[PDB]
Amino acid sequence: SDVYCRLTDEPLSVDEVLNAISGPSQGGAVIFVGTVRNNNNGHEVTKLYYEAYPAMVHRTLMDIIEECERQADGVRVAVAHRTGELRIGDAAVVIGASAPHRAAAFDAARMCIERLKQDVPIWKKEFALDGVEWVANRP
Numbered sequence: 001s002d003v004y005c006r007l008t009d010e011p012l013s014v015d016e017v018l019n020a021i022s023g024p025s026q027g028g029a030v031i032f033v034g035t036v037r038n039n040n041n042g043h044e045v046t047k048l049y050y051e052a053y054p055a056m057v058h059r060t061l062m063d064i065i066e067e068c069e070r071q072a073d074g075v076r077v078a079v080a081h082r083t084g085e086l087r088i089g090d091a092a093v094v095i096g097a098s099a100p101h102r103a104a105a106f107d108a109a110r111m112c113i114e115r116l117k118q119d120v121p122i123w124k125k126e127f128a129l130d131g132v133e134w135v136a137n138r139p
Contacts, residue, residue, distance in 0.1 A: 001023075001076070003062070003065060003078070004016070004017065004020035004021075004078035004079070004080075005058055005061050005062070005065070005078070005079050005080075006079070006080040006081070007052060007054050007057060007058070007080075007081055007082075007083055008080070008082060008083065009082070009083055009084040010082075011082070011090070011091065012033075012080045012081075012082055012091045012092075012093075012094045013080070013094075014031055014033060014091075014094055016080070017031060017078050017079075017080055017094050017095070017096040018031060018096055020076075020078040020096070021076045021077070021078050021096045021097065021098035022098065023076070023098065025074060025100055026074065026076065026098035026099060026100065027099075027100055027101055027102070028098065028099055028100070028101055028102030028103075028104075028105040028106075029096060029097070029098040029099075029105055030096065030097055030098075030102075030105040030106050030108075030109035031094065031095070031096040031109070032093075032094070032095045032096075032109055032110075032112075032113050033091050033093070033094050034091065034092050034093040034094075034113070035089055035090065035091055035092065036048055036086050036087065036088050036089060036090050036092060037088070038088045038089075040126060040128065040134070043128035043129070043130055043132055044128060044129045044130070045088060045126060045127065045128055045129075046127050046128060046129045047085060047086070047087060047126075047127045048085070048086045048087075048092070048124065048125065048126050048127070049084065049085055049086075049124075049125040050081070050082060050083045050084065050086070050092065050122055050123065050124060050125075050139065051083065051122070051123040051125070052081075052083055052121065052122040052123065053121075056121060057081075057120060057121060057122055060119055060120045060121060061079050061116070061120060063115075063119075064077075064079075064111075064112055064115040064116060064119070064120075065077045065078075065079065065112070067111070067115065068097060068108040068111050068112045068115075069108070071104065071107055071108055071111065072099060072104040072107065072108070073100070073104075074099055074100045074104070075097060075098070075099045075104055075105070075108045076097065076098045076099075077095070077096070077097045077108055077109075077112050078095070078096050078097075079093075079094075079095050079112065079116070080093070080094045080095075081093045081094075081116075081120075081122060081139070083122075092139065093113070093116065093139065095109060095112045095113055095116065096109065097109040097112060116139075117138065117139065118138070119138075120138065120139065121137055121138070122137075122138065122139045123135070123136070123137050124136050124137075124138070124139050
């Protein structure tokens with residue numbers, strides 16, 4: 001069953017991510033949703049932009065997905081990250097991991113987002129209302 005790994009300017013779909021990992025053998029599923037908070041480091045955030053070269057980002061996510069899926073039998077991982085402009089409350093990243101039982105779903109979902117934050121080459125440009133801006137090549 002083919003990997004689900006989406007970059008898109010459109011709002012993310014938790015329903016697509018869950019559907020992509022569902023199955024009659026999968027009894028547990030864990031979805032993580034990361035959203036733009038209204039405050040960063042004691043400043044009031046106004047907007048974010050995300051930039052990425054898709055093939056190079058998809059390559060890194062495949063490493064993570066393979067690492068998560070080889071942790072335990074029957075584990076399936078799917079990932080969606082948004083690009084473009086996001087506002088407060090928008091979902092920036094949605095990851096899901098399913099397994100026959102809940103423990104392995106939790107294990108894989110946690111690992112997937114930790115590696116994604118550590119390793120995935122997606123540029124972040126964050127703006128605060130008082131002029132400050134942050135740039136980083138991770139999200």
